[PDB]
């Protein structure tokens, strides 16, 4: 509440400057140079000042050679509707074909709405930082009974993840990682100098490590990051691909024995910070572009990944994301999902299907407002299934396409409310048909090598429960070149993804599920239209009839109970089950869809079920008969036809 002049010696020049507080204190609302003057112990003797500086860990391994920023957000498509996050006006975007984008100025306002203290006055930070309060977002977790915490606080400018450990006593060990553009780094308080704390500096970006010499030693026991590699991934990776990179590590850790009782190792703590970078790179990219507009196709891509990453972080750790979602983008995406034919979504482009399904997840999160979005994801699966050579391992084009559409379906299975079962059941049936022998075969090879097929397979959501440890081992890649402990690792992890109980993303939604006495003995369910079949080794299934294949005196049993119109029976029908009629009076080529709406089961007597097929169209049925699918010369293999009639039939020969 005054004005002050500042005189000093510049190598022989008696320069003086006059700093006005009457101007600046009113001009910039956040400034109150009284608290700043207090925050520097301006009377602190050089002794105690020297005492404060020595305590902070300084960077020995301090370098990092230049990296190039990936160009992440794309230039506006000519004549897009540059559109307001706060004011999402009806019919402003016309279709998916319409170029569209949300302008970055208020989108930044809606991501970093939350406000709080970025640099605390907690012990390690108040020694080094002029305390700051900024608009921020944070990713936060707490584990080991709240005695190990991580907090990824970030602005549109820089991110500080900070680790905190408790030693079973009152002692707290604290270590923080500060990442951002070098110029945007916060204000240093004491005699401190940024290079001393900079572990990596490339072009415009930096990575700073802040901790006590006491504490860096206490973390060095279990946490030695490859600071070099983290910095390159945070810099050179596009914000959407970075969020997938982290998403890979979590899911390939989750089904494994990693995050049920987390291990406080280098890798997991490395990932915790990399989660914070994933959200921050998206917020940083939007904020740093200036007063422009972010292409919606980019936004749908990048905010799909964060939304999946938000889910998987909720399930591994008791973790929260606070301040990286704009309701404006969610209404914009939701309004564009009234544009398009959800029934005919699969008819469109590779590019358009992904962009649509991304908007569908982003539009209504907390799935279950307008439940027609499921039918859109189902349409992609169906249109993929027919053009996809059945039973084959889906190539990375189709698999990535279907993973995006799988998330909409996955959040409906979370609900207790059915939300229009019909589309939902058709998705699981098509997933079940796609879970074939080599679909599993390529996935397990993909989990032995950690490759892209490790994240997702339609089998995860299928109606297939004959899957256990022993069954997978028979279908694995046979190669001696592969580590058959990583093969054993793959079998363990795969079965951890589709444990029928304590997963909630396999079952408890069907109408025909009520007709089972013992649910653990059910191997598979085929929900057709007008009928659903219960394939189980359970004799007491309250269905319309009971078939028992000639299984063997090896496998417990093999029963097929058809349920007519998903209305059960009073009690399981008693007496001998029906024999499976054998059929040879059936010609191999058909020019009509005589098998439309039917199911085709392939089972080995000793192993169990091998493949399921849903005859959905003419090109599906002609793909079955014309191919080498029917091999009766193997007597160990039979072919079951499950009809909408409610009948079970075996195929023994063709002309």
């Amino acid at each position, epitope marked *: 509440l005054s004005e002050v002049k500042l005189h000093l010696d510049i190598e022989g020049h008696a320069s003086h400057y006059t700093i006005p507080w009457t101007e600046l204190m009113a001009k910039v609302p956040g400034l109150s140079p009284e608290a700043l003057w207090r925050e520097a112990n301006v009377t602190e003797d050089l002794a105690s000042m020297l005492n404060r500086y020595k305590l902070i860990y300084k960077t020995s391994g301090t370098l990092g050679i230049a990296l190039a920023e990936p160009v992440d957000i794309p*230039a506006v498509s000519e*004549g897009s*509707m*540059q*559109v307001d996050a706060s004011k999402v006006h009806p019919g402003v975007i016309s279709g998916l074909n319409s170029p569209a984008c949300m302008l970055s100025a208020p989108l930044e306002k809606q991501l970093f709405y939350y406000i709080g203290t970025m640099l605390p006055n907690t012990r390690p930070h108040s020694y080094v930082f002029y305390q700051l309060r900024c608009h921020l977002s944070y990713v936060a977790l707490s584990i080991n009974g709240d005695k190990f915490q991580y907090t990824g606080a970030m602005t549109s400018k820089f991110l500080m993840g900070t680790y905190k450990r408790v030693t079973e006593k009152g002692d707290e060990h604290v270590l923080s990682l500060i990442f951002g553009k070098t110029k945007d780094l916060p204000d240093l308080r004491g005699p401190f100098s940024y290079p001393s704390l900079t572990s990596a500096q490339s072009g415009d970006y930096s990575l700073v490590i802040v901790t006590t010499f006491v504490h860096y030693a206490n973390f060095h026991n279990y946490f030695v990051p490859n600071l070099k590699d983290m910095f390159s991934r945070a810099v050179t990776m596009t914000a959407a691909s970075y969020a997938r990179y982290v998403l890979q590590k979590l899911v390939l850790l989750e089904m494994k024995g990693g995050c049920r009782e987390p291990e406080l190792d280098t890798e997991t703590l490395t990932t915790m910070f990399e989660v914070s970078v994933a959200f921050f790179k998206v917020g940083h990219a939007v904020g740093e572009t*200036g*007063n422009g507009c972010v292409d919606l196709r980019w936004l749908a891509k990048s905010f799909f990944e964060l939304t999946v990453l938000k889910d998987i972080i909720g399930i591994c750790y008791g973790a929260t994301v606070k301040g990286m979602q704009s309701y404006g983008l969610e209404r914009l995406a939701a309004m564009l999902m009234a544009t398009v034919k959800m029934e005919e979504l699969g008819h469109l482009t590779t590019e358009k299907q992904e962009y649509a399904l991304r908007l569908a997840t982003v539009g209504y999160p907390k799935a279950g407002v307008y439940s027609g979005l499921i039918g859109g994801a189902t349409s992609v699966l169906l249109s993929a299934y027919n053009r996809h050579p059945l039973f084959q391992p889906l190539h990375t084009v189709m698999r990535e396409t279907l993973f995006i559409g799988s998330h909409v379906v996955l959040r409906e299975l979370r609900l207790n409310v059915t939300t229009q079962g019909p589309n939902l059941a058709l998705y699981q049936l098509l997933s079940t048909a796609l879970c074939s022998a080599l679909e599993i075969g390529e996935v397990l090879r993909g989990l032995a090598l950690g490759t892209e097929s490790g994240l997702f397979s339609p089998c995860y959501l299928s109606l297939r429960f004959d899957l256990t440890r022993d069954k997978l081992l028979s279908m694995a890649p046979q190669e001696a070149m592969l580590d058959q402990a990583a093969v054993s690792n793959a079998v363990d992890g795969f079965l951890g993804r589709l444990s029928l109980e304590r997963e909630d993303r396999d079952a408890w939604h069907l109408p025909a599920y009520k007709c089972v006495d013992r649910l653990d003995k059910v191997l598979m369910i085929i929900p057709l239209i007008n009928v659903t079949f219960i394939i189980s080794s359970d004799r007491e299934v309250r269905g319309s009839a009971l078939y028992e294949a000639s299984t063997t005196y090896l496998s417990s049993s093999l029963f097929l109970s058809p349920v007519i119109m998903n209305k059960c029976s009073q009690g399981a029908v008693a007496g001998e089950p029906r024999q499976i009629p054998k059929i040879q009076n059936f010609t191999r080529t058909q020019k009509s869809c005589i098998f439309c709406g039917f199911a085709l089961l392939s089972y080995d007597e000793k192993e169990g079920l091998e493949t399921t097929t849903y005859i959905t169209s003419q090109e599906v049925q002609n793909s079955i008969l014309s191919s080498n699918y029917f091999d009766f010369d193997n007597l160990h293999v039979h072919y079951l036809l499950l009809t909408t009639n409610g009948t079970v039939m075996e195929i023994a020969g063709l002309y």
Partner: T-cell receptor, first 121, second 108 residues
């Protein structure tokens, strides 16, 4: 904060040539295109020309088309405007503003201070 | 060439009045109009961007509205530093064009 400073103001004979300079500091220069707006004495603001992000494409209003050439050096952070066949109507104060922001779709934020242009021999 | 037609050309009101500026386009410009306050001697400052977005550092008394044809800048409560001349701007189809501008004299 974000400063645009334009310096090439002068007095020119009618039909002659002047070169304007627009010195922009405080932001990533190449990621932005530029616009020019002029205000004649006792006249409203008029959009004159836009410099594209790449700089290869120069699009002008009908009055100054084919007479104005815009060259931008990203390293210099400065946009140069070359004006030929100056007319008495062209006299006024010229402003440069950054428009496009990850570039094609444009609009002006705050301009620079402007520079005086006097086409009167 | 799209023609931007502000009404009025000039206007007078006391401190604290509700002032409303209009600006119409010859075609549809769908949501690509902006407003700029120009005090003489100094630089113009943008006030509103998407015909709707009040942009940062501008007091909230200013508001903008409209779609396609008719657009509006309304300063809800006139303040002394709002004596100025105001121009609307279409950027839909270039060549871009301003309005003739509305000067806001302050009443007597």
């Amino acid at each position: 904060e974000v400063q645009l400073v334009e310096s090439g103001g002068r007095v020119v004979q009618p039909g002659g040539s002047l070169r304007l300079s627009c010195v922009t500091s405080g932001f990533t220069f190449s990621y932005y295109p530029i616009h020019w707006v002029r205000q004649g004495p006792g006249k409203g603001l008029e959009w004159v020309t836009m410099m594209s992000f790449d700089g290869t494409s120069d699009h002008c209003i009908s009055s100054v088309k084919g007479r104005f050439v815009m060259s931008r050096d990203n390293s210099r952070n400065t946009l140069y405007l070359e004006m030929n066949k100056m007319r008495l109507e062209d006299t006024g104060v010229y402003y440069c503003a950054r428009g496009g922001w990850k570039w094609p779709g444009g609009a002006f934020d705050v301009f620079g201070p402007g520079t005086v242009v006097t086409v009167s021999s | 060439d799209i023609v931007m037609t502000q009404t009025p050309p000039s206007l007078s009101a006391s401190v604290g009045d509700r002032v409303t500026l209009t600006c119409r386009a010859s075609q549809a410009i769908r949501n690509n109009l902006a407003w700029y306050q120009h005090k003489p001697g100094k630089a113009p400052k943008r006030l509103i961007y998407a015909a709707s977005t009040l942009e940062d550092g501008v007091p909230s008394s200013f508001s903008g509205s409209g779609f396609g044809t008719d657009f509006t800048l309304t300063i809800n409560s006139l303040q002394p530093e709002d004596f100025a001349t105001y121009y609307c701007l279409q950027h839909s189809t270039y060549p871009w064009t301003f309005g003739q501008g509305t000067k806001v004299e302050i009443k007597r």
